[PDB]
Nucleic acid binder design. Sequence first.
RNA 1: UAAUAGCUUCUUAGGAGAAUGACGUAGCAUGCUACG
RNA 2: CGUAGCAUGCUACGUCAUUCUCCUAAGAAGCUACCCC
Lengths: 186, 185, 927, 75
Amino acid sequence: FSSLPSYAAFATAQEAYEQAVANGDSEVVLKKLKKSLNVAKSEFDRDAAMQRKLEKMADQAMTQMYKQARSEDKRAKVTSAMQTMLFTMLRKLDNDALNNIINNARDGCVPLNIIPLTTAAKLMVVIPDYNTYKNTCDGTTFTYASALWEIQQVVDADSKIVQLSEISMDNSPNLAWPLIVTALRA
Amino acid sequence: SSLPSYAAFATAQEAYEQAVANGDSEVVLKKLKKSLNVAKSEFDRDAAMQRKLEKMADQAMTQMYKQARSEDKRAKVTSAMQTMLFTMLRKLDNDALNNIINNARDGCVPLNIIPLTTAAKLMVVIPDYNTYKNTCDGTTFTYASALWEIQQVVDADSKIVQLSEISMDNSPNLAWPLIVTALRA
Amino acid sequence: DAQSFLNRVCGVSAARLTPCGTGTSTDVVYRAFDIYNDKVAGFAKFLKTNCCRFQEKDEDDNLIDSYFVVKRHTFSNYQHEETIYNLLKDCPAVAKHDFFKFRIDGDMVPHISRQRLTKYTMADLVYALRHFDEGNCDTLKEILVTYNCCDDDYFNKKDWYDFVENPDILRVYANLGERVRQALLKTVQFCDAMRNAGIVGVLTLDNQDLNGNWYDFGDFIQTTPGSGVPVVDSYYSLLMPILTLTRALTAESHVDTDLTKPYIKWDLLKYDFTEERLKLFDRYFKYWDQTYHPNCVNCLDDRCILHCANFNVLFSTVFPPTSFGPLVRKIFVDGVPFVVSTGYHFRELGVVHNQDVNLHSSRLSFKELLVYAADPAMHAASGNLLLDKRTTCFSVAALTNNVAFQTVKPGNFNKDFYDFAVSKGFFKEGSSVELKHFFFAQDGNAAISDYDYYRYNLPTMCDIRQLLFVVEVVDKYFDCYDGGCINANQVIVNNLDKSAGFPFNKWGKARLYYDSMSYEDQDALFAYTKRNVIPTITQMNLKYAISAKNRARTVAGVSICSTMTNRQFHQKLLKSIAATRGATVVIGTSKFYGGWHNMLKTVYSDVENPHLMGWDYPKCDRAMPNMLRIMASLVLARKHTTCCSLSHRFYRLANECAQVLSEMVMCGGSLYVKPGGTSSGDATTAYANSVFNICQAVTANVNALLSTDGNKIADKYVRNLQHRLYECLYRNRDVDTDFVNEFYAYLRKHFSMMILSDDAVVCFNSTYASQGLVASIKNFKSVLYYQNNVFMSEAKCWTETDLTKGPHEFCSQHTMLVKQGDDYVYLPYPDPSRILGAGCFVDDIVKTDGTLMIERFVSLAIDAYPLTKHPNQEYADVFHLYLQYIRKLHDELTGHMLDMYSVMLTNDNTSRYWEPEFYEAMYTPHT
Amino acid sequence: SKMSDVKCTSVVLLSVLQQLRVESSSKLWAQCVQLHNDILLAKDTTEAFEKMVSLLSVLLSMQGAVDINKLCEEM
RNA sequence: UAAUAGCUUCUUAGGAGAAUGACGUAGCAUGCUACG
RNA sequence: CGUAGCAUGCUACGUCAUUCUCCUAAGAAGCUACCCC
Ligand SMILES: Nc1ncnc2c1ncn2[C@@H]1O[C@H](COP(=O)(O)OP(=O)(O)O)[C@@H](O)[C@H]1O
Ligand SMILES: [Mg+2]
Ligand SMILES: [Zn+2]
Ligand SMILES: [Zn+2]
């Protein structure tokens, strides 16, 4: 606001008033210069208020444009992330059995609940105790979802690998149940 | 507030007080009133910003305090929690907790959770004959303020050793630490 | 003589009979009539004194369950029933009658003798299962025993009747299944026998013995043959809760409908069971005159969605559970194949197809990207198959390669506050204030042990001729508010920095998705959900908060794709409910500033002989039926009569059922199928719970008013109210708004209510509940038994006979009448062991410092201020303890700031938080 | 007033065990959680102390986790 | 590590109102100079 | 007695500074209902 001519007018009015006071000027001149100082001060104060308002508005606009820029820089990032997620899951699809069952459908629509059940190549059986393990998947091959599955790995709740010989009735308490057995379709 | 602006306001106020003490009439008194009022306005303007600064330097003391204290509190959490636990454990003054704690200082730590049910199994290492002598009397084993029946004592090489061998004369020949497998009695 | 009559009752049929009663006299029995005439009406336990009863004993002189009812009446009824029987003689589902005139004393009394009935009839089974009272259930135990459902020692168990403590009772009830189903089939024969013989009559439940036969022709008028009509409006409707409690349609899963034969192997790819549903409906509910559309997308209005949805909730228990859920389809985006869901197959709403299917797309905008990321089609299709034996719920896929076990760590201990508390004399031995609310920890298998509680949700077929009137009464309860669809720029979000469900939580909070989507494509998504169905994965999280008992607390985080549209759809009504004062649904009414006293004075809305009452729903959010949740979502969507059309409202209902009711739950790296029950994380959870609570209260009132005798009702206005209630329930198909207004006025006059989503306080008239003209605790227990499939034991529902003590417990805050100023006001105080438990145990290590948290103990002292007025001193000392601890906290805070710097705080106004006046002003009605 | 000291010392002890990464061993963490929940839900002082001993012997079993000799030396 | 609701504390911005003071233009009362 | 100008005091409109009050929006922290008894 100091660069504006209003500040110059206020300064020269103050200088003239001080010079008149130091010079022993008459009462009329002193009062007239005081009123000139007053009218300069009022306008300089108006200019200062205008400058404060303009600066606060420009800073608020800068904050608005530095927030919308961040919003539009995060929109593209999440869009790229979603596209990457949607294409990796595509590249994970078993497009032989899934294509066969979808083309086998009458209208092309098949329930989602049977998309893994007929196409998934990997099966994860979670077993809480030994009786369930003996009932559902005893041995190295078991039959689920009308298909033959062969055991490929067994891990415990600690994500430690467990050999198939360790899963016995006497060794059951020493195992960290539940057991996640990962099998493959055969 | 006794700032230089208040000093000017105070000398103007003293001048106006003297004028009021005279207080006859009229124009000089009104001029003193206007001068006092403009001095008061200047002092209040130059003291409101000082009050604002004093208020804004109290949102930087609290904000710094409840950040330094927060990081100090969440930095020493691994050790303060353990110190608090053992202070409370001293405060309880129990017979069994103090027994297992005082045994764990000498190295006589259990290798599994101490069981509660009778005829349940506890495997505890005994790392010296000195700690063996206090805890083991005959075939009885005093631990956790309870009496246990010793089943199997195995040395560090997992070779079984009968209680006949454990004696002051033959103790240095053994392979410490012994592991005693007892059942709650 | 008493022996020639016995020889005549045997007749040509060679049967051995023992006379129940004595000496050719009537046998008086307490039965379960479904009656409606000029004076009485209802489904109630009457006492019949017009039937001589003989019991047949087979060879070896054992007593079998086959009777010879010899009902005697006037000669005109005898001849009329003889003609009607001779018309219906050839039907198989008619009990063999025998009409004979016997010289009793000095005249020929005409008797009609029904041969080989059972002791009880279908109405006795229906009543004993719909009006269950565990203290007096001797017509259900005898029915279960005499039909080999259990071995008569099963009742020596402590809780045999309970559904949550003893699930095996279901296996007992299903043993009645094939006995009910054949009964249904017999009806479809008997109706035909009427239709082909030109006989008009009402089929009542109390005329069918449990074998299936029909034996009452008293009120049958005959017309020209081939043009009769059987009125089965009040027969199938009362029987409806029994068709899924006893699983009467299990034998339809087997080939040739024979229980010995193996299951039907339906095609895995088959999803359109419309023809099978129509075949089942035309075989069992053949003469149910109202139209039935298997797919609810063809329904006329929101009262035909309930009817067809209730039918499909029964007809979907015979179809494989792998054919439901989303219907995926292979689409192409810029030449690469996606597999995305183009519809849904609801067990309740049938097959629903999307209308915006973009085959061969080119680009994916943010709306389409969000939709394709939200639905579980890609997630389940690209995951590996899962066989989780820890649960009974269906498991779809395992997204990761290993299952994730999530634990709940224990809470931090605030030793400074505990030492201060024991310094002030608390926590002594035998003290009335003791630590009971702790921070409990959980092992790895907690997250899947709690989801397994969804095994308490069973497919429940609600009574449909009564639900369609309870809907009207509940909508009358919800008439004060207004609602409608709002634009995207009017949606207000309280907290934006909370997780956005699965899979959106891997990239940001809800703020990212509320800032990344402009209002144009935020309204485009909402207008997409009005013409398409969006399946949605909802995550299960374990809550980390202080609790009284150790059982885990899971919360469902719903995807931002669902909440972003549910807020837009429902928030006008949700903000109008939360801004209305003096209504039944007290949500948004503060307990501060004298808001509890205003609540308790608007509860007592001028009832005659007030008694307060409160009930607790066991497993409210896990055992709520699908039909009641659809009912709540339809009552909450009745405000949209102008903003959106009928199809838009139906697709919004389908989206709510796909994203809330029966969804895909991500429970620790695994997609399971939620059988039903509301999720505790959607937008309309508390308000839908309130609608369901009011529905249960009105259903209990209707049951209590109908099940009353009808001749003992002395107030001649209430007898007429019952006689018109039965008509508006079963003998009337369209809305009768005059009587709905009259019954709503009756409920507000005698059953004033206060609802917070399941926390109900009732101020019922004591005289009427004593007479039975209004619901009592036993009525709510019966309603919860036959309509929620849970048993509400009388140890958790309270009754208060004195109003100067307030409700015993409402929103976990006890109420007491204390003197403030010069008048008595009701103040709510919490459990005094909860405030100490919150002070001593904190869920964050920085909340243990104390000096940093003075605005945390101020809130606790605000919530625990009323304890000062409590007569018990150890309760009153809890407030002074917090005041002294706040003073000590501020003293050591000023000490620490005088050490860290060299100048104290200049402007310090913490000098009012250790004064009782600042907290006393918190419970003053000025503001 | 020693009954409610056990209900808090067990909370601090389970916090210590959780900070010592016993959370990774599911079989041991299940036993620690059960002991903690049974200490909190205990009306009799003898049962609470008997379960507190078993909960503490989990802390004492691991040799290299805490330095028991130093921690008790501050007494 | 969810929805909704209520309450407490702090900060910022905006608006409105009241009071005090500085200043600038319009209206009223009084005194002085010039002219009629 | 009127007009023009100057000076002093009193009212109306506008600008600015200070204090106080109320509200509307935004942000941050916390507590309770929720879950279980
Ligand atoms: N007061 C009475 N005394 C004797 N018989 C009656 C009386 N009132 C009605 N009835 C007859 O009894 C029938 C209703 O009884 P109901 O419960 O149907 O017995 P049931 O099922 O054995 O026929 C009516 O059809 C009527 O003819
Ligand atoms: Mg009858
Ligand atoms: Zn329909
Ligand atoms: Zn709408």
